[PDB]
C-alpha cells in the first residue's frame, strides 16, 4: 500500500512536505500520483493530480514531484484554511490504493478562551420528565476542556466527554455538554451551575 | 458543471442488499476514459476503494471483495447504481461515488457524502424541544435557542432556523454518543437578543431516516 | 570576518546567479523591515577562518 506520516506540523509562512512511500509498491513504475484535501465535515476535493501539473482552479501554493519512488507534496504559504487530510492515491496491479492519512498542524495562533452557555430548560420537558439542561462550549484553541457540573457539590460530567474537534470556518475547536439531571433531583437542585476548565487557564 | 448527488435508505436492517444509487448530472459517460466509481471511508481511518464501472461495461471491482460488490450502469437515466451484500457491522461509513475522467485524474469531482450506520438498531422517534431563551440568556449576552432533538440512532440529520434565510448564526455542532446508544443535538443560533421575541424560530430537524419534520418554537419562560 | 556567506534565502538558486542584494529574510503574519527582529535574519553570515 501507501504509508503516510500520521502528524506534521507546519509555521505560517514555511513550507512542509509530505512523503508518501513505497511500502511494498507493486505500483510498478508509479506513473501517476494524486493527492486530495478532506476538511472535517466536507467531502475530499483534489488539489494535484499527475504532479508533473496541476488541475484547473487550485493555487500555486500546491506543487508535488516524485524523485525516485516517493511522492511529496510541497505546500508553500501555509495559512489558517489549510489544516486538513491529505490523502495519495495511485493505480496498482489490480485495485487502487488510497493510502493513509495526514493531518496538518498549523501552530502558531493565540490561545481563545471558551464562553459558556447555560441555555435553561424551557417549560415543556420538565413536565415529562426529561430535564436535559445543556452547557454547551465552543470557541478555544486547545481543544481540551473539562465541564465541572455541579449544583454546589461534587463535580461530575457523566456524559460531556465526546471529543468533537469541529474545525469550522474560525479554526477553533468546539465542546458538547450534556447533562444527566434525573428528572426527580430538578427540584432539590438550586440552579446547578456550570464551570469549565480549560488548557493553561485551569481557573 | 459536475454534480454527483447520493441517495437511497441510510438505514437499514443488517445483513441485507444496499441500494446506494449515485445521480449524475452535467456530463456523458459514454466519453472515452470516463467512468463512475465508489469509495469508501470508515470514521477515523483512509479512504479505500470498492467498485469503478467503465464506458464500456466494464465493471471492475476490488480484489477482496468480489461477492458482494455488483455495480450497474442506467446511462438512459443517468443514475448510477451500486449493490453491496453481507452486511457486517464493519462496513458503516460514508460512501463518496466520485467521476474518473482519465487515468491522471484520479477521481476529481467527488461527492457529498451518505453515512450508512447499520449495525444493530433501527430508527428512533425524534424528540423536538426548543430551548427557551430566558433572561440567563439574554442578560447573559447573546440569547442562543437551541432545539434539544435527541432520542434517534441515525447520525445524519440537518437542521436550520429559519429555513431559506439566517445561513450563519447556528452552530451545528456534531451529536455525543451517551450510554443509551443515541445521538442527541443542541445546535443554537448566535442571533443575539435584538429581535427574537415577538418573532419565530424553528431549526427545521431534517432526520430523514425517521420521516418526521417537526417544526415548534418556544416563549420565554422566567426561572 | 572579510569572508560572508549568504546562510538564509528563500528559494534555491538557479544556475549561474549571483545575488549581489542583502535584503533582510521574511516571515509570517508581520512586516518585519529587518533592524533587529528575532524572527527575520541577516542574509548573510561572516566565516570565522582561525
Known amino acids: 500500500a501507501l504509508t503516510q506520516p500520521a502528524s506534521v506540523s507546519g509555521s505560517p509562512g514555511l513550507s512542509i512536505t509530505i512523503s508518501c512511500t513505497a511500502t511494498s509498491s507493486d505500483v510498478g513504475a508509479y506513473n501517476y500520483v494524486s493527492w486530495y484535501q478532506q476538511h472535517p465535515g466536507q467531502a475530499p476535493k483534489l488539489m494535484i493530480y499527475d504532479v508533473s501539473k496541476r488541475p484547473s482552479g487550485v493555487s500555486n501554493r500546491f506543487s508535488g514531484s516524485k524523485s525516485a519512488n516517493t511522492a511529496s507534496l510541497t505546500i508553500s504559504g501555509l495559512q489558517a484554511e489549510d489544516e486538513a487530510d491529505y490523502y495519495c492515491?495511485?493505480?496498482?496491479?489490480?485495485?487502487?490504493?488510497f493510502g493513509g492519512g495526514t493531518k496538518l498542524t498549523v501552530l502558531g495562533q493565540p490561545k481563545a478562551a471558551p464562553s459558556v452557555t447555560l441555555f435553561p430548560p424551557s417549560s415543556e420537558e420538565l413536565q415529562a420528565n426529561k430535564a436535559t439542561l445543556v452547557c454547551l462550549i465552543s470557541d478555544f484553541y486547545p481543544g481540551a476542556v473539562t465541564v465541572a457540573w455541579k449544583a454546589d457539590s461534587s463535580p461530575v460530567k457523566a456524559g460531556v466527554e465526546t471529543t468533537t474537534p469541529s474545525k469550522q470556518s474560525n479554526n477553533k475547536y468546539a465542546a458538547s455538554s450534556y447533562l444527566s439531571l434525573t428528572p426527580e433531583q430538578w427540584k432539590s437542585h438550586r440552579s446547578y451551575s456550570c464551570q469549565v476548565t480549560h488548557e493553561g487557564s485551569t481557573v | 458543471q459536475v454534480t454527483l448527488r447520493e441517495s437511497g435508505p441510510t438505514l437499514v436492517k443488517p445483513k441485507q442488499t444496499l441500494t446506494l444509487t449515485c445521480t449524475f448530472s452535467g456530463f456523458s459517460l459514454s466519453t472515452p476514459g470516463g467512468g463512475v466509481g465508489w469509495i469508501r471511508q470508515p470514521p477515523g481511518k483512509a479512504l479505500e476503494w470498492l467498485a469503478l464501472?467503465?464506458?464500456?461495461?466494464?465493471?471492475r471491482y476490488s480484489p477482496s471483495l468480489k461477492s458482494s460488490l455488483t455495480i450497474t450502469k442506467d446511462t438512459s437515466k443517468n443514475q448510477v447504481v451500486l449493490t453491496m451484500t453481507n452486511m457486517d457491522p464493519v462496513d458503516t461509513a460514508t460512501y463518496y461515488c466520485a467521476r474518473l475522467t482519465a487515468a491522471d485524474t484520479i477521481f476529481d469531482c467527488w461527492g457529498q457524502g451518505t453515512l450508512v450506520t447499520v449495525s444493530s438498531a433501527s430508527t428512533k422517534g425524534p424528540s423536538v424541544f426548543p430551548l427557551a431563551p430566558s433572561s440567563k440568556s439574554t442578560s447573559g449576552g447573546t440569547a442562543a435557542l437551541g432545539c434539544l432533538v435527541k432520542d434517534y440512532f441515525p447520525e445524519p440529520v440537518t437542521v436550520s432556523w429559519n429555513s431559506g434565510a439566517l445561513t450563519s448564526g447556528v452552530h451545528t455542532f456534531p451529536a455525543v454518543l451517551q450510554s443509551s446508544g443515541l445521538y442527541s443535538l443542541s445546535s443554537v443560533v448566535t442571533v443575539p437578543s435584538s429581535s427574537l421575541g415577538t418573532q419565530t424560530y424553528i431549526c427545521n430537524v431534517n432526520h430523514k431516516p425517521s420521516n418526521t419534520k417537526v417544526d415548534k418554537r418556544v416563549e420565554p419562560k422566567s426561572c | 570576518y572579510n569572508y560572508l556567506y549568504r546562510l538564509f534565502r528563500k528559494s534555491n538558486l538557479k544556475p549561474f546567479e549571483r545575488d549581489i542584494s542583502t535584503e533582510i529574510y521574511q516571515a509570517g503574519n508581520k512586516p518585519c523591515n529587518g533592524v533587529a527582529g528575532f524572527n527575520c535574519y541577516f542574509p548573510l553570515r561572516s566565516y570565522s577562518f582561525r
Open positions: 492515491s495511485s493505480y496498482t496491479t489490480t485495485s487502487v490504493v
Open positions: 464501472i467503465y464506458w464500456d461495461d466494464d465493471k
